From a paper:
GtfC synthesizes both soluble and insoluble glucans (α-1,3 and α-1,6 glycosidic linkages), while [name] and GtfD only synthesize insoluble glucans (mostly α-1,3 linkages) and soluble glucans (mostly α-1,6 linkages), respectively. All three enzymes belong to glycoside hydrolase family 70 (GH70), which cleaves the glycosidic bond between the glucose and fructose moieties in sucrose during catalysis. While fructose is released, the enzymatically produced glucose molecules are sequentially fused into a growing glucan chain and, depending on whether a 1,3- or 1,6-linkage is formed, the resultant product is either an insoluble or a soluble glucan, respectively.
With this work, apo structures and inhibitor-complex structures with acarbose are now available for the catalytic domains of GtfC and [name]. The four rings of acarbose occupy subsites −1, +1, +2 and +3. A surface diagram colored by electrostatic potential shows that the active-site pocket is small and negatively charged. An acceptor molecule or part of a growing glucan chain has to bind farther out in subsites +2 and +3, as indicated by acarbose binding, or beyond.
Residue numbers in the entry: 221 to 1047
The structure:
Amino acid sequence: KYNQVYDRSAQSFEHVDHYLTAESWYRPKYILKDGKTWTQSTEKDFRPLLMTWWPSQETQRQYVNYMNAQLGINKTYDDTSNQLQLNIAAATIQAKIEAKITTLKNTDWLRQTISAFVKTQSAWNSDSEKPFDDHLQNGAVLYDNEGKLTPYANSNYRILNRTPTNQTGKKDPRYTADNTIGGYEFLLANDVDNSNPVVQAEQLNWLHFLMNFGNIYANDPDANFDSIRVDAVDNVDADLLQIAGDYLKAAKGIHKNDKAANDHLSILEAWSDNDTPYLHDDGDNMINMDNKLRLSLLFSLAKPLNQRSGMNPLITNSLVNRTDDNAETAAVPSYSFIRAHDSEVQDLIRDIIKAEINPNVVGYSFTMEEIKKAFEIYNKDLLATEKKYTHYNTALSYALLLTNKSSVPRVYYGDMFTDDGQYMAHKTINYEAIETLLKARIKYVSGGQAMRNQQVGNSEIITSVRYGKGALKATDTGDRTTRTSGVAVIEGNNPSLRLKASDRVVVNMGAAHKNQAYRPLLLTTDNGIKAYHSDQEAAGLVRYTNDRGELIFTAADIKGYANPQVSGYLGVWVPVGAAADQDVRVAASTAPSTDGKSVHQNAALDSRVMFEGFSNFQAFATKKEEYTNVVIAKNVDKFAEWGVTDFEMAPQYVSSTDGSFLDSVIQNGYAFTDRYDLGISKPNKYGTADDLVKAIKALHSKGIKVMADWVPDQMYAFPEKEVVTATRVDKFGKPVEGSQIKSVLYVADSKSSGKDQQAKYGGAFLEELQAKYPELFARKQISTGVPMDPSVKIKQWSAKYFNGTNILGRGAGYVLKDQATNTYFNI
Ligand SMILES: C[C@H]1O[C@H](O[C@H]2[C@H](O)[C@@H](O)[C@@H](O[C@H]3[C@H](O)[C@@H](O)[C@@H](O)O[C@@H]3CO)O[C@@H]2CO)[C@H](O)[C@@H](O)[C@@H]1N[C@H]1C=C(CO)[C@@H](O)[C@H](O)[C@H]1O
Ligand SMILES: [Ca+2]
């Protein structure tokens, strides 16, 4: 009777949405002070609810056993423990607890011990959330749409799995490269409901903010983000692809001509093979990766010698059949790459961890210790010829990427610099070859392409040829600038490649290059790869074409090698006698686009070079001059020298520290809490907001456009709690068969600060946008059938704007329940 509630007022409990949890404390009518006198209880005398209440006899017995063992009491009560025997034991436990409280006059040990005991109960930990599925964080929980117990978080939407393939709910029949629905809605952390028109409008607001970051933050139009990279296209409602499209038109006029489109060249991270034709049918407002060419490169050059495939795919298995690409404008624009901050980097780290560290590693949720231990092996393997974990023939992949036509190459930072360590600190063994190839791409690479696969000796070789500036076909003759341009690349993927004397590899170079002298650019040696940085530096190894413009090679030149850079043969030749400042690139015409497509893969777009300027595993910064953006501002001249046109920067948002995923362990910037906190409140991994502005300004100085990561899928770890009606679900959002979480209350962390940059800039510019661009809000979106709803600005992120959250390890009955009436405790 003494241990009841002081007053049934909300201030007497530790509530969440006026509900009670297992770890909740309360203020009783009387405190058993020191365990002797029943004293009236002040406001600072909160006590754990579990000290005097239990949601079943079993849990009470477990409480008795655990606290007896923890406090020093001998006797523990077994299976058949009578009802009242447990009550008297709990009274003894309370007496001992208050006695030990007065002996220390704090209540920290009690908090810790109660938390531990709660975490030892079945329905208060992961056990009630199991079975785990293929979610990157073990499981998912979908917030119910009509939660009677919590209208706090309802929604008329939460439309799931609306990928570009599955935008309308049924799989699109127009695209059949992918059997599946082309993605899944639940990827990581708290999943943003991008099917809510309010959230769509807020995403448009965030996009406008990012595109005008300079003006909005430092009153400087020189420091605006030029382009965007839409992250996790396959995990969000694809209506955003229209919204981001529309805007890029209405706000920047990319549809009008080609110069605007190229000045705001936006890309997608869409993995499903259906996404590139879906985007081409959308109107080519953005460009998608060439996944086919990526896989061809990976499986023909990078894989170990056992698992390496033939070389023919490198020609045919792509978006452009580069057998004879004699076209002024390619059918579909694309950007190609071999590695990225995630693709074929964190995968290799996972492989190493699962092999020689922690075989039980779950998804990509690494620990920093595991990361460093694995990186030791990674850095050693990168330097060996016999590679167990890392890529072979990286230089060959980049030699093909930077000479290919009809695609925009994206050079990854971690292929020129160490994936770990400080930014642009230590170079890789391939740095020289890649830099030489970029400079030679500026100087020589232009015109039509021709690729040939020749079976010679015991193996095969491939020859990629660029005819030169102006020469679109082999028959075209061009002019003097044409003759000093063009390039030949000869690659083999077998170290055992040995030709006989009777074997000759013929390489047609184009009608422009008849009887011309050619000098080696890159050459494979036993050392590694010799780069020739000028005609002089290689004048000892000149060779000539015949009267039909054919380079001819034999066993003297082509043989199999096996060194830490080449598992095969690499030979790149350029014509002799080009000006040291010769440039074969083109700028985009101002002529009005006519075909209804915004971005065109013309000769001007082929001249662009994307650069992914960050690694996931960048070492943290000690001093100012080690910040990433500072070093970028310092070394902008290097990027200008390399021919970089679009610099894809890391996501500059400030990182959370929960550690539930790799993104929040190395703090790349994809795990964030405030979407507008671009290094404002705190510095990000790469520098303060002012450092970012300086970097953007320095990049714009040399004419380089800047690309910002647009990440509308998920947000990590909000500070405020919230109780929601929810159901256990897989990554596809299907309810788990007979889980204990079925329309059940759950304590998610889905309430934003409310005094962050999200409160400041949230929906600020909406009023402006429908002023200047009304048609953006006229469009009836595809998945929803209704236009964006900018009426309400999103100042505080609530669970109503979210599809759900990864399982949190809190339990299915973590929200307390009166076992008599079988309803949750309310207030
Ligand atoms: C997490 C990261 O990748 C996610 O997508 C993965 C897919 O689930 C995989 O299936 C894989 O697709 C391959 C399949 O064979 C098939 O889909 C094919 O068509 O394409 C692939 C061929 O090899 O692709 C991914 C491999 O991990 C997710 O969809 C993607 O958006 C994610 N990328 C970034 C996202 C976030 C969000 O926080 C950031 O952490 C990083 O920027 C990246 O991780
Ligand atoms: Ca999603």
